Design a protein around this ligand. Sequence first.
Ligand code: NA
Ligand code: NA
Ligand code: NA
Ligand code: NA
Lengths: 295, 295, 295, 295
Amino acid sequence: SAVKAARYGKDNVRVYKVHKDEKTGVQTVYEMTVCVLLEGEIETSYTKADNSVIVATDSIKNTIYITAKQNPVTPPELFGSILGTHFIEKYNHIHAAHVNIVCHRWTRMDIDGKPHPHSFIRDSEEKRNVQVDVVEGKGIDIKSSLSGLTVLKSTNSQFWGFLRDEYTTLKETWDRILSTDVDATWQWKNFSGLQEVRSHVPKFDATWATAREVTLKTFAEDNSASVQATMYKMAEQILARQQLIETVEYSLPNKHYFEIDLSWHKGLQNTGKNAEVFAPQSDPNGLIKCTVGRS
Amino acid sequence: SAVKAARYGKDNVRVYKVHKDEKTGVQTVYEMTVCVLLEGEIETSYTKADNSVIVATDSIKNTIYITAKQNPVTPPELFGSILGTHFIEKYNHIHAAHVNIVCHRWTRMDIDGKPHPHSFIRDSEEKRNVQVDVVEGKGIDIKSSLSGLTVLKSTNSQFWGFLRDEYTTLKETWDRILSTDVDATWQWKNFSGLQEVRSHVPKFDATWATAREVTLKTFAEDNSASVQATMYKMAEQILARQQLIETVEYSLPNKHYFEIDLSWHKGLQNTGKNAEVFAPQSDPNGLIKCTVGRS
Amino acid sequence: SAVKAARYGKDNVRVYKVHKDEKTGVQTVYEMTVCVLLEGEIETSYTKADNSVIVATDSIKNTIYITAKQNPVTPPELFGSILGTHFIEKYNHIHAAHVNIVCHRWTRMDIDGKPHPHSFIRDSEEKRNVQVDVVEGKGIDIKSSLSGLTVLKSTNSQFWGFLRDEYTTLKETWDRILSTDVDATWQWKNFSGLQEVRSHVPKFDATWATAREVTLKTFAEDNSASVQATMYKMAEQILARQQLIETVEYSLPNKHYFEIDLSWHKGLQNTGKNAEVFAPQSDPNGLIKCTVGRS
Amino acid sequence: SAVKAARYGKDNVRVYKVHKDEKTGVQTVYEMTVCVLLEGEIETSYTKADNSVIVATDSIKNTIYITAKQNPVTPPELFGSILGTHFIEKYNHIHAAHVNIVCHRWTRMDIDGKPHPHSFIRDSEEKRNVQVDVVEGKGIDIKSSLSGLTVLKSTNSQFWGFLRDEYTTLKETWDRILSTDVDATWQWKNFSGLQEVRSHVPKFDATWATAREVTLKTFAEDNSASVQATMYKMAEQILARQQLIETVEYSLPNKHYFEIDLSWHKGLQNTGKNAEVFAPQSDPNGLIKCTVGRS
Ligand code: NA
Ligand code: NA
Ligand code: NA
Ligand code: NA
């Protein structure tokens, strides 16, 4: 037999960092969950019981903490690049590092209309993520994303004109609820290395912000013909506002809210234009994906 | 053998309701998860296979939808009271109804600084809950709560002066991180029935708001001597602002963020006043509870 | 204001213990999750910022490990009794200890038809639990349970003869699927203290075994008239086989499997006696509870 | 802009099927969760709001039920192949179908040492999965797997000889606990289509069985030098017993059980050879992956 591929590392590394402005007294926290997987000339660990090639996952964990101590952890695209570059530069036999970072929200509390200096709230489970692949001799591949952004619009979504055949029971509609959990990924142009990533650092938060804004505005304002159509419109605008983006990927469930016919009870009218009470469905759900790139 | 106690019903009933202001065009959504458990003279269903006494849980589900269609679903204390009262009034052999409601957040989206008429976002997993017990001849017992309110303060929490003995390894501290998931319950004075509940309807949202505000303000401003001390201060203020409240209960985990000693690495200074990078602990966690009432 | 009730402690304490038979070479593992909540004269921690009365939750955690090191951890009813008794005996101002233990399964692996000496498998998420309340001057209250026992029978369940009114749409049936997650609790007679608990130690595993067996046999053999009826039959037998049990409580969801009408497609026959493909429903679900005691 | 890639479909489709042997009276159940994602000439749904190319996800759901009604659902490799082939054969503009199936366990109950004809138990959360990719003109690509197989061995695992540098704090050990959740995937040689898949149907359950057995036996009998080494030995044997397998992939977390030093308490000895009580760690965890193919 032969090893075709191999990676190993430490997953679910939770990290908190605080920043304290000794002048203002203002504190800022960052919390994330880190995964680092390494690749290289490690095959003999598997086939010959040779642990000499193994950088212990425990040591990988240590490195994460130390790197966070010595470098900024924001924006996460920079921190992930610094951490992955470390492993390939530091170990000769290690040629690729895969760094996944999930950023948790800690939003500054407003008290009495004033921003509080050291108190924070988790104002949703929405995540900001990065996947950073650092490969010896091939630079730094960064995919940024937002996930867990849960939205609903109560009208101005439609779905008619789809294929109808003998498997079809769904009725066309000109007014429905649209709810989804947004997963959006933007892939940056390859960077030659850390110097290039650092030259672009302001672009990372601004583009996350843009992506979020565009996502929210388009969902709220588009009179949606389908999930497919609306998501293309989001991807298009993002690509239009940030030239260093190569592709935008969207993955969107369609979380169904079913009308409930109550006519069997005293002729109660609860469908179509009289629809007021709906049953959210846990499963199944539609799943719509698309990757948009430059033409 | 004998049946000492029995209840049965329908759990995990998801419900959505939309309200449409035909004048403004503004829509407002409500989403909740409902549990209804009934008690009464139903013992023979268990001992004699006599299903005649059973109101099918399927029918309970139907009733929930119909009630939501015909009545306001907000505030949830009122809706739960209406639903529980229905079952005890409608069925002779049913003498108590237990209604649990979890309200999910759907917060109106602001677009371009303007509030959007029909688009919403789940701006956290914080829940607003009610437990409503409706008992034939004993009125309506309501417990209101907020849960899943996740907060963190990065300083102005202390913990020193606790009991030290041969089981103790914890060091006293004058500056630590405090993070918790707030579970807060306020128990209303018993209501004689629906008319009384309706007479108090404005008090329910205002008190939820107050409880939330007090909870947030006190956490952010208290230089906490312990979780115990801070939570008492919250309970006290709530009781002070709403006389129809009999008791306030708080249940607060202490979600530990451990200092990481990096001194073993190039003498890196990361503890005490140099503490910048911390390891959030998933488990174990402290759990602190208290019920405060009127003196 | 005044403190009406208070408890505090350490939750989610994961513990593993190994036992090694140096003669046979056979090893046996135990894994559990422990919660310990204490009550006593601790009110001033809340009202006066007085931490002197607080046994740190960190120390509670330590005590758990030490107790497990020095005592058997099986059966869990004994271990919980030892741990709770410790806190009330050791601290003067602490008058009650609440110990919750969840036991995780680690079942010995059979290899080549032979039992393996030190390898184990998690052969389900079924748990064995105990809740032990140790109260100064009132002895030791133990509730034992099994939970997460998921079963299904594909026929020999019925549900007809229930109440029908204008809220009812459910059809009577003489053949349906019955699936549930079994939660069963048996409450022991109060014990005067540890000596009495130790005198009964063999009864704890045998009764857990009996409860499980009775639960499984009755579910499989009863031609069920309803969930209510079947669960009473389980409770009754358990009470009949173990006199030191005061009450048996059962909590059983009814996890619905809905028939799917495929007649709209080429007249496909998939209901009633032709029912072959079903849609498991995630929610809502029926929830049926009962407490059976001695008559 | 341009669409680079696109797929859409229905996820989280729960399906139950019962088989009844009218001769023996014996019933057999199958429960699974299905995801079907389609690809083809659908780009205009995204860019031109053209829903004519869309096979509604609702219809996909229907098709799943109908296919299960008309075909065997076991082994899942066959059922997934039948379902994916359907979509590409049935719709001209649809050129690929991606079918994911998770099979849930429903193990026949033994009562009184006798197998019960219609009662089942979920004897773990271990899953049997298939991923089936059906691509017009390129045949049928099947990946089979088991997942959620949770095991532990209490001794006969070692980890020494790894790389030590200034990031390393981990100590070498010759005796530790090894616990993991097994995720194992075997990739079949490409099949030309359904006829070929059907010719191999007996090989699918036998190979799942083999993979499981080899996995269990090797974990229990290997005196493990590392996770890497042990998993290679599993992959190798599987490849050796089934020639139609092209590659075997393993993904294995290392779920750490940390020694607890209790020496600070009355000189309690709980480490190294005296190690009896351990603290399972929820996070972080090691993550070890490898793909083994034919040499
Ligand atoms: Na390198
Ligand atoms: Na009544
Ligand atoms: Na005491
Ligand atoms: Na086709």
